[PDB]
Amino acid sequence: VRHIAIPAHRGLITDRNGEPLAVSTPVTTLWANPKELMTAKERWPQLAAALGQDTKLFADRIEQNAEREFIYLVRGLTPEQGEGVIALKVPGVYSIEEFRRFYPAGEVVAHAVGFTDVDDRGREGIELAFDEWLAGVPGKRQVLKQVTKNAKPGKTLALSIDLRLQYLAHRELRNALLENGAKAGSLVIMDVKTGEILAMTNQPTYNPNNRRNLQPAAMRNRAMIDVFEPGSTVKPFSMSAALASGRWKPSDIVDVYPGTLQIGRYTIRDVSRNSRQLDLTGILIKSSNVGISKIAFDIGAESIYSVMQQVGLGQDTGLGFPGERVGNLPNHRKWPKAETATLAYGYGLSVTAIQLAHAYAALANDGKSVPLSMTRVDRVPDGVQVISPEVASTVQGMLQQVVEAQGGVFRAQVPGYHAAGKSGTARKENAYRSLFAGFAPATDPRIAMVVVIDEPGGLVSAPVFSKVMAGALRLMNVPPD
């Protein structure tokens, strides 16, 4: 008396609307006891041909494994072509009825969903992260040579992803990469109220249904793994600290002439050096490093560091995904002028696109952080007031200006709505990405979005934000403001 395991039916993964994303398909896997196959050697050429395997290679295998009384032959034939071997009716041949995964949306949602190994086990994305929920429990059968235990099936998992926004994201980031001859990219879309990831796309992608001759670059979940210095896209957090210090208001002026600022041996340089007096909105529109450095010297790094930590920058996302990088929000006891400045204009830390989008979500959600979710959120968690509604509101208005105002990013305007956001030029020898981070509608935000384009500056990312946001808001029947 022995025991064979009854494979469990892996739980169905859907998008937030119940569109199937990963499905357990019936297949049949064929084993054999050589000892018994040794008695029908005249059948081998027919068996081999019907397993695709070559005649002499096939007979080599069985002959050497003659001593053994178990080996697989082939895993994962269709049940229909699989019966075609049992239709040969050959002694020594018995069949296991297995499942394997189909991914109906294929490459569109490859990274978010991931895929299973040969054993039907999670290897990437959600498939790994929710392996235990999805796998269920093998059953157990006594083989003589009854059923000890029923197999319990994995449970259905409804992702936060909206496949319509995913299709849109995937298409538009694809277009943009070829339009800009760029190597790679990420686009994250978040529900600012619920912390739901509505879309996550990386280029290059792959077909999880056909992982033959798969490049490791294609498999990289960039949105969750690539870390970079966010540059100007974290200046709104530096400004949130400035406006919470009690020492700054939006109409305050900073003199950024002559576009450089000596701090001892170090020289802070602005990307454009055609300014003297700028208001706090101007500092953002111009992305003046001198502007934001001077404010930071006045309020202290501690206050900036604290806002940045509270919106999740360089923090664990709690998403439990396989390769997730955390980045680095570095701390000091004493913040010298150099480190204070570089933190404030966003070279003093490294983050993932998902972290940036989460931070933008907090700001867009009138300053309330909500934990990230890759699963459909039915009951919104309370989440944390990390920036005051009033400050959040002011910084929203300032970022709407960055998009609208003359001098501003006109290519990020969303036809129909008022959008808010900030471009930046990231640094991963010095690899450079174009970033755009923002939300809409500006006056009543619903959606936060980050666009990353590797080696296409940040006017590159902006038009993508434009077209993807327009679509996402319409698909969500958000009323034009």
From Swiss-Prot:
Annotated localization: Cell inner membrane
Alphabetical list of InterPro entries matching this protein: Bact_Transpept/Beta-Lactamase, Beta-lactam/transpept-like, FtsI_transpept, PBP_dimer, PBP_dimer_sf, PCN-bd_Tpept
A Pfam family assignment: PBP_dimer
Catalysed conversion reaction: Preferential cleavage: (Ac)2-L-Lys-D-Ala-|-D-Ala. Also transpeptidation of peptidyl-alanyl moieties that are N-acyl substituents of D-alanine
UniProt GO molecular function: penicillin binding; peptidoglycan glycosyltransferase activity; serine-type D-Ala-D-Ala carboxypeptidase activity
Membrane disposition: Single-pass membrane protein
Gene Ontology cellular-component annotations: plasma membrane
EC number: 3.4.16.4
Entry keyword Heme: no
Record pathway: Cell wall biogenesis; peptidoglycan biosynthesis
Keyword DNA damage: no
Keywords, sorted A to Z: Carboxypeptidase, Cell cycle, Cell division, Cell inner membrane, Cell membrane, Cell shape, Cell wall biogenesis/degradation, Hydrolase, Membrane, Peptidoglycan synthesis, Protease, Septation, Transmembrane, Transmembrane helix
Gene Ontology BP term (one): peptidoglycan biosynthetic process
Induction entry: Mainly produced during exponential phase of growth.
Domain of life from the UniProt record: Bacteria
Record-annotated active site: 232 (acyl-ester intermediate)
Listed Gene3D superfamilies: 3.30.450.330, DD-peptidase/beta-lactamase superfamily, Penicillin-binding protein 2a (Domain 2)
Family statement: Belongs to the transpeptidase family. FtsI subfamily.
Entry function: Catalyzes cross-linking of the peptidoglycan cell wall at the division septum. Binds penicillin.
Entry protein name: Peptidoglycan D,D-transpeptidase FtsI
Gene label: ftsI
